[PDB]
């Protein structure tokens, strides 16, 4: 139980690379020590920014909000998806149906209420203007998954969360989000920008997702952790 | 993972409603999109940072020190020790952790050290759901139980704990206007937790408080999300 852990969360700032591009969180310093002894910011947070995670009612009408995510969907058996060696080829490399099937071939069927990670070696560019990729007419470009295989997930699995290292859920030149509106809406959660999957084995370890709570709300940054 | 059965959520939740120590709507959201008439959901969130089942980073109270980044993640994972003091505050709504509580909390369950967590239930998580949990007199002074910075003194000195917590709105207990433990235990590089929930929920010893605490670059504080196992 109190074996060994590994942080997976992003240290985000107002440099962090947003799927809109700009700046996705200020702060103002209310309080300083100099002057009155102590510290406060008052921050305003666009909650889809940074390691955050996407509840149902994030493309939902009357999904669940981050505050009525039950505590079982956020201690999640960790499941990664290795597809670095197809992203390195294909930039827009998306976890196929095909890429999933690999992963009981080498590590056994996927636990109940478990969290499935895509590993496209793509949570290390979150330090310069290449995370988002844009393209000159403002297209990103980043792995991603499937929508066909995110309905995999939910017909033939007990997956209740879907981890991505990059952005989105579904891939960069994804106009539709079709990944999106097949996990979401079933009370399935997401999550986007995982660090450090690298350090993690692709089974066995156990997800810790610190998912936040301020009701009705679509998503917001989450510490998560990883007992491996 | 060995004896594992079940995982607690020690985390309130917290919106615009929701009690602080200045008494003001600590959060405003608001939805930019909404999903009939832009497909999806998205709010932005103006807030304080020390608001609800928050951590307070060492930058809090000091000022070099530790900010909410900057707190390792082993010093995130604490083994949890919690001193009940309900029976005491029933009676005044200001008992302090006094250091004979942490005495008789040794030789009760064994020692503190090693990275320990410790937590104070004082029964206080109750009273989010009224002016209780404040429990401001009519003339303005909160009166809520908290540590006794004789008590923080103690868990420096003698033992390694690197990290606190309470069930209400601050370290110190109500009537403080100096916020002595403020200064005695966060300017050492040592963070505390503020209104944490479920306490009386785990057992008193032998439990593993996972902080999920953020880490938003140069914070002195911020909602976080605990938990508790085995
Ligand atoms: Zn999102
Ligand atoms: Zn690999
Ligand atoms: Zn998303
Ligand atoms: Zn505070
Ligand atoms: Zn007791």
């Not at 889809?48 to 969907?73: C, K, M, R, Y």
């Not at 793509?122 to 980043?142: C, I, L, P, Q, V």
Request: charged share 15%.
């Amino acid at each position: 139980g109190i074996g060994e852990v590994r942080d997976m969360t992003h240290v985000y700032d107002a440099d962090f690379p947003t799927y809109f591009g700009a700046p996705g969180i200020e702060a103002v310093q209310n309080f300083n020590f100099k002057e009155h002894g102590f510290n406060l910011f008052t921050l305003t947070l666009n909650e889809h920014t940074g390691t955050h995670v996407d509840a149902p009612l994030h493309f939902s009408a009357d999904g669940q909000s981050v505050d009525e995510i039950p505590v079982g969907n956020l201690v999640c058996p960790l499941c990664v998806v290795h597809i670095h060696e197809k992203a390195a080829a294909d930039a827009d490399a998306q976890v196929t149906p095909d890429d999933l099937k690999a992963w009981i071939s080498a590590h056994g069927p996927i636990p109940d209420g478990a969290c499935v990670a895509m590993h496209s070696g793509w949570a290390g560019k979150t330090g310069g203007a290449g995370y988002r990729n844009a393209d000159s007419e403002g297209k990103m470009h980043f792995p991603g998954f499937h929508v066909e295989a995110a309905q995999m997930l939910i017909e033939e699995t007990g997956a209740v969360a879907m981890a991505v290292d990059t952005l989105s859920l579904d891939h960069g030149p994804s106009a539709d989000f079709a990944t999106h509106y097949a996990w979401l809406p079933t009370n399935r959660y997401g999550i986007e920008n995982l660090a450090n999957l690298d350090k993690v084995p692709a089974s066995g370890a156990t997800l810790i997702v610190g998912a936040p709570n301020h009701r009705g709300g679509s998503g917001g940054p989450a510490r998560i952790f990883a007992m491996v």
